[PDB]
Curated annotation (Swiss-Prot), chain B:
The lineage of its organism: Eukaryota, Metazoa, Chordata, Craniata, Vertebrata. The chain holds residues 283 to 376 of 376 of the full protein. GO terms for molecular function: structural molecule activity. Component of the 19S proteasome regulatory particle complex. The 26S proteasome consists of a 20S core particle (CP) and two 19S regulatory subunits (RP). The regulatory particle is made of a lid composed of 9 subunits including PSMD13, a base containing 6 ATPases and few additional components. This is 26S proteasome non-ATPase regulatory subunit 13. GO terms for biological process: meiosis I; ubiquitin-dependent protein catabolic process. The gene is Psmd13.
Amino acid sequence: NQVHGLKGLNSKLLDIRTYLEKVASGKLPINHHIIYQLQDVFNLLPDASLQEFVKAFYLKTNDQ
Amino acid sequence: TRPANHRQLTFEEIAKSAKITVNKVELLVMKALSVGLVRGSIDEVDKRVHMTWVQPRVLDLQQIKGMKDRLELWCTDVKSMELLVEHQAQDILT
Amino acid sequence: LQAAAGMYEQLKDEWNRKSPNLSKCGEELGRLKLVLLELNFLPTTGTKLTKQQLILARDILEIGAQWSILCKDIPSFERYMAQLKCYYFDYKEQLPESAYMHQLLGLNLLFLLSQNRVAEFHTELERLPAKDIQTNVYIKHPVSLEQYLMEGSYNKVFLAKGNIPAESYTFFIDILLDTIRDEIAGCIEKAYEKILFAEATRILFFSTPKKMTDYAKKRGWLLGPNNYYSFASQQQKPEDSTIPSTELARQVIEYARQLEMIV
C-alpha cells in the first residue's frame, strides 16, 4: 500500500509540473488554486520526531 | 521572499520601512493574522516576526517558474525512496 | 655451527666495546646470511644433540639485532626478532636460549607500544603466563608503561627511562614521546576550552614554548592563553525533539521495514 502510494503520488505531481511549464510559456491561464497549493509545501516545513515502537512479539511465540 | 525556505524573519526592518512607530505597526499585522491574509505570530521576546504561511500574490508570471523547478526535486525524492522500501521486506511484499 | 670469526661470531665481538666499530656492522649483515644458512640446518632435524649449536646460533642473530638498532636499522631488528620468535618455543624445545633473549623480549614490547600495535603486545602476553621464562626485570618495565598509557596516567609514563639503558632500548622510547604528545593534544581538545603556556609545557611534554605555538595552531586552537573550543560542542548535543532528526536506531526508513520482515 505504501509502495502503491509512492507511484501514485508521483503521478499527481507530474500533472502540476507539466502545467506550470505550459502556463509560463504557451500562455495557459494562471488560477489562484494552482499557486495556493504549491506555496504551502514550502511553508509547513515538517520536522521528524520520535515514537511508535514496541518489543512484545517474542514473549508470545516463547509461551506457545 | 525570506519565508518559505526558512521560517523566521526580523520585525525591525519592517517597522522602519513603514516609517510609522512600533506600537501601531503590530496592530495592523495582528489584524492581518486575524482575517487570514497572513498566518503566524509576532514574538516581541526577540522583536522578530515568525511567519507560518504567506499568501501567494495571484497572476504573477514569475511565481509559476519558481514552483516548477522545486516540484521536479520532489519527484526525484519519491523515486529514490521507493526503491529502498521495496528492498527490505521484499519477501513479505511478494 | 659457530667456529672462528670473520662472519661467524665476528658480529658478536663487534657488539662489545672491545672493538666498538658500527662501521663494520653494516657490511656484516650481508655476510651473516651466509653463516646463517648453516645455522638453520640444526633445528627440527636433531634436537638435544644439536643443543650447543643452537645456543650459539641464536646468540649471534639476537646480539646483532641489538647492535643494528644503534645503526638504526628497522627492517633488521624485526626480521631477527621474527626469526628468533619460533626459537623461544622451538619444537618440543631445541634449547637455543641465551641471556640476551631476556633483553630482546623487553625491547620488542617497547617497540610494539611506539608503533601503536597494542594487539600484538596482548598476543605476546598470552604466550607469556609463566613469566619465569626469562623472569621480569626488562619485561616489568613494558608492562608498567602499558598500564600507564592505558589508565590515562600520562605523568607516570616512562620517557625518562629506557633512554638510560643505551644498548637498544633508546630507539623505541624516542619515537614513543611523539606519540604520547599527540595523544595529550587530542584529549585536551575535547576536554577543556582553554590552555595556558604554564599549563601546556608540562601536559604535552613540550621542551619549549616554541613547540607549544607550533602544535596548537594546527588543530586550530591558538588565540592566546585563552581560547574556546570545548565548551560549546558539549552543550549542543541533548535535545532533538524540537529540531528534526534521524541519527540513531539507524536509517529510519529501512528500520521500520526490516523490523516487520523479521517477525
